[PDB]
């Protein structure tokens, strides 16, 4: 359950700009495969489907701990490692 924050200003550009940390939860990569978008209109439906928001998936349901799928990807890991070590 995601939120639109920007409308792209170019008619030629037709690509959903998704955050990198979202890749692991989707179990997907930038191979060009198409993702499906279903807009949610009703406010009650918004509060009901908010359980699929990234915040609710931050807590890994197996261990009750932080989900590593929403943590840093390997490139971000390289950056942070260079910075701190």
């Amino acid at each position: 359950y995601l939120k639109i924050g920007l409308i792209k200003k170019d008619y030629k550009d037709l690509t959903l700009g998704i955050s990198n940390n979202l890749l692991s939860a989707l179990s997907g990569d930038y191979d060009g495969d198409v993702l499906n978008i279903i807009p949610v209109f009703d406010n009650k439906m918004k509060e009901h489907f908010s359980l699929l928001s990234p915040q609710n998936f931050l807590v890994d349901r197996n261990n009750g701990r932080f989900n590593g799928d929403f943590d840093l990807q390997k490139d971000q890991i390289l950056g942070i490692f260079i910075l701190n070590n």
């Binding site: 942070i80 260079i82 910075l83 701190n84 070590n85």
Partner: protein, 98 residues
């Protein structure tokens, strides 16, 4: 780099965001200015970056020696204490290198 930083004071102050950004800008500009040298041997070359330099951090009245990049990462990871106005607790600390 100011050699000493007070963690809880930066976290509670309303100047926390600009301090984080200033540290970030200093680190990235210094990295852009310098060039990395590879010895390709057991010995390691003398590469001096702003991230590698050590600093002293005052947390709950105790001094911990950490790197500058460790400091900026710790400030990023310590957003809850600026949001809730609660002092940083020493048990909520770890090895930022690992």
């Amino acid at each position: 780099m100011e050699k000493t930083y007070n963690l809880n004071d930066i976290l509670l102050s309303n100047e926390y965001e600009k301090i984080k950004e200033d540290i970030k800008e200093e680190i990235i500009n210094d990295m852009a200015s310098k060039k990395v040298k590879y010895s390709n041997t057991s010995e390691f070359a003398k590469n001096d970056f702003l991230k590698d330099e050590f600093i002293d951090l005052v947390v709950d009245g105790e001094t911990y020696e950490i790197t500058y990049g460790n400091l900026i990462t710790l400030l990023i990871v310590a957003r809850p204490f600026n949001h809730f106005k609660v002092p940083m607790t020493e048990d909520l600390l770890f090895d930022l290198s690992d």
